[PDB]
Design a protein that fits this description.
2 copies of one chain form a homodimer. With about 450 residues, chain A is an alpha/beta fold. Chain A is about 25% helix and about 20% strand. In chain A, strand 7, helix 9 and strand 8 form a beta-alpha-beta unit. The structure holds magnesium ion (2 copies) and zinc ion (ZN) (4 copies). Chains A, B: Keywords: Disulfide bond, Hydrolase, Magnesium, Metal-binding, Periplasm, Phosphoprotein, Signal, Zinc.
Chain lengths: ~450, ~450
């Protein structure tokens, strides 16, 4: 039952050119914040991850989609906020590696242990560590793993796989890149094979391709991983209709949704940023991607469906949702693809908050794995990297720059970034904290021994 | 028994390679956060601005000087945090201009009105608006304006000058660039002249150069501003010895410290970042500036002195302290200079917090005017801009990149950034807010009518 307040509106209250018109606050927040602090148990937890969604990414998407004085009804609505560090470790020296990759950072919040770039569910000694999801299951809680990326990718994989390298998607890659994890060598298996063992109640995302591979050993040797899932009682859905038809999800009938061969379709289309793109060419206006589809479930829909099915568990549930392509498009220096995925994540967050506000014992956390390349710069900027001018909702031009790599892919950045929370124990994300603190925060909120 | 807690230790608690070793938290924070919330009146306010000190800057400086798992005793110690927006306005259209300069942002928090880049104390219609310092004085509270930059620069000027352009330092500049403000033309005069009129109790910084000019009119025409200063009852000091001598600071003997012709000297020195610097050049270890001087007050010293002289006013006081060269060095793509000035600012922040915890009715706020160019990237990064490898306290290499400009100066970025506070009404910086909210937050906390 409703009791802890969600920020209803932090947009500019009026005329931004007038005194007080750009204010996002309408009065003192001391009482609102006190009402936002509760140490009661967290029955459920919904962790929404925006891959590469640093503060810069959030601002750029707000400016374009909601206007500078706009307000993300989801992302900007969490009352308790802070900044956390996501540095990784050098595998050999054990010293800090200032710029993490997705695997190391996801392993940090899901296991509570720092690790080297590329590792999933293991530390620098390559020792396995239980994930928050495996722990949630073990305690009898329902579990959900949702993503717009291929399920073998770092963020969703980190919750159910323990491999020496994120590249070990299926048997083939594992045999070659993770010999110690290869099933035919006595290991736990590839990422996909371990995901099948983790047996979370709900798993929705892309990456159907790897399931076409066949196991090299074990009870399901010779069969495709898809065939294995069928044989192990999984109910596989591949589109919006089939997913909507699902009435239950549990250990007897775990749900596995494969909605795309690889990553799911991005929300918006737009040209890639170019050298001196803001000075030479004209401004870009993003446009809806025709490949999006009504047959393809949206992040928001997968989030609602997951919540519906998971909420059935009286004990409670842990659910993770990742807006994966914010990061992917940031790499491809594609403003529209990037901003579109942030807008996409915001809707998912809205479903999570709307649900949590009514339920009353749900902790919702919104953050990112690491910071990224994109920067909002002056219109007349002449940079060495890739830049693009964009027509925002304000009817003004915004210029974005990607200048930390001459290579094709734009790199990650080590800056600390925003972490926001709402609900029981949300106070633990305020101020300065570490990405590994999030693991302990979730563990404690759910009361996991 | 100080009820309002100041985060004493959020550094990695143990061995970062071990489970929980990188955790910055030791237990649940709900109670501590509740003890941090008070709506009682704020007798005093200390606003510390790190020019161009976005989260990236804070992270790089912490990484280098304290280690990734380190902790800034000052900057990282404020318990209530959020992210605020600082977009400015297009003067002609009145629409948002995504990347502000120091002038528009400073104007925003000091007056509560958004404006165009370059404007100081006026909106897009060039109309004046009271500053928080002018209002504080009018209310009978002591006023302090401190900066490591030339006092005519945007940040400290925004508190005491209303001009159409930030370039209007003195008579000459004003006459040519701010004719409507030019004294001999009916206006209120240049930034320096208006500063003298504002007459804050304490004004410490550099920018002596401009005081050499002579008024082109007014009750002090022909004389130099320095002369007009002393002629108007100003108590002028120019070094640590003299400054440390002043025992009072009020309207009859307003203190005016001019410790440098232009900007005050930087704390640290290092080579400028270069193309492929991290690859082609050796890792750098910052060196203390031999000419920082012991006859030159440090930001922390000026902060401490200011507080002494201003706290004698039983009514209360408002003090703004700026670590200016973080921004400037960031513009010069100079990691060491940039980091050194952040370390510098952290010391002043510790003094403010130390005083605030004791006094119990002081609101301390730490933030920045806008984000900057510097980014922490991967060691092997091959970027198109300027890079440099640095030897951190961790005994490991950190690479910093600047690639948002091909010109001489690296530029600002529009990303929302961290704002943290401690004391009465600190809750108003939490969550998403706007830079203009800060003006209103300070005005209300002090209860200025
Ligand atoms: Mg991902
Ligand atoms: Mg400044
Ligand atoms: Zn990522
Ligand atoms: Zn990435
Ligand atoms: Zn600035
Ligand atoms: Zn600047």
């Amino acid at each position: 039952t409703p009791e802890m307040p969600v920020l209803e509106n932090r947009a500019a209250q009026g005329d931004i050119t007038a005194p007080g018109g750009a204010r996002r606050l309408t009065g003192d927040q001391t009482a609102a914040l006190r009402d936002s602090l509760s140490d009661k148990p967290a029955k459920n937890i919904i962790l929404l991850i925006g891959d590469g969604m640093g503060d810069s990414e959030i601002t750029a998407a707000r400016n374009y989609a909601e206007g500078a004085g706009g307000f993300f009804k989801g992302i900007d609505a969490l009352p308790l906020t802070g900044q956390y560090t996501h540095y990784a470790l050098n595998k050999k020296t054990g010293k800090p590696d200032y710029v993490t990759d997705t695997a190391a950072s996801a392993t940090a919040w899901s296991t509570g242990v720092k690790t080297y770039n590329g590792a999933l569910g293991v530390d620098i000694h390559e020792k396995d560590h239980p994930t928050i999801l495996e722990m949630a299951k073990a305690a009898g809680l329902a579990t959900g793993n949702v993503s717009t990326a291929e399920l073998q990718d770092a963020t969703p994989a980190a919750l159910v796989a323990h491999v020496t390298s994120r590249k070990c998607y299926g048997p083939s890659a594992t045999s070659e890149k993770c010999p110690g994890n290869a099933l035919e060598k006595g290991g736990k298996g590839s990422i996909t094979e371990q995901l099948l063992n983790a047996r979370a109640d709900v798993t929705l995302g892309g990456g159907a391709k790897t399931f076409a591979e066949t196991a090299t050993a074990g009870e399901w040797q010779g069969k495709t991983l898809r065939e294995q899932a069928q044989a192990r009682g999984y109910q596989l859905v591949s589109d919006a209709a089939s997913l909507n038809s699902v009435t239950e999800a549990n250990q007897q009938k775990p749900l596995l949704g494969l909605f795309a061969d690889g990553n799911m379709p991005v929300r918006w289309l737009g040209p890639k940023a170019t050298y001196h793109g803001n000075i030479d060419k004209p401004a870009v206006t993003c446009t809806p991607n025709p490949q999006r589809n009504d047959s393809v479930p949206t992040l928001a829909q997968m989030t609602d469906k997951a919540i519906e099915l998971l909420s059935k568990n009286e004990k409670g549930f842990f659910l993770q949702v990742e807006g994966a392509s914010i990061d992917k498009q940031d790499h491809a220096a594609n403003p529209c693809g990037q901003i579109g995925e942030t807008v996409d994540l915001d809707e998912a967050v809205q479903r999570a908050l709307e649900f949590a506000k009514k339920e009353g014992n749900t902790l919702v956390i919104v953050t990112a794995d690491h910071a990224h390349a994109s920067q909002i710069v002056a219109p007349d900027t002449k940079a060495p990297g890739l830049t693009q001018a964009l027509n925002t909702k304000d009817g003004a031009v915004m210029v974005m720059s990607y200048g930390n790599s001459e290579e094709d892919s734009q790199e990650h950045t080590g800056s600390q970034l925003r972490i926001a929370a709402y609900g029981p124990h949300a106070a633990n994300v305020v101020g300065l904290t570490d990405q590994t603190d999030l693991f302990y925060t979730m563990k404690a909120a759910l009361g996991l021994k």
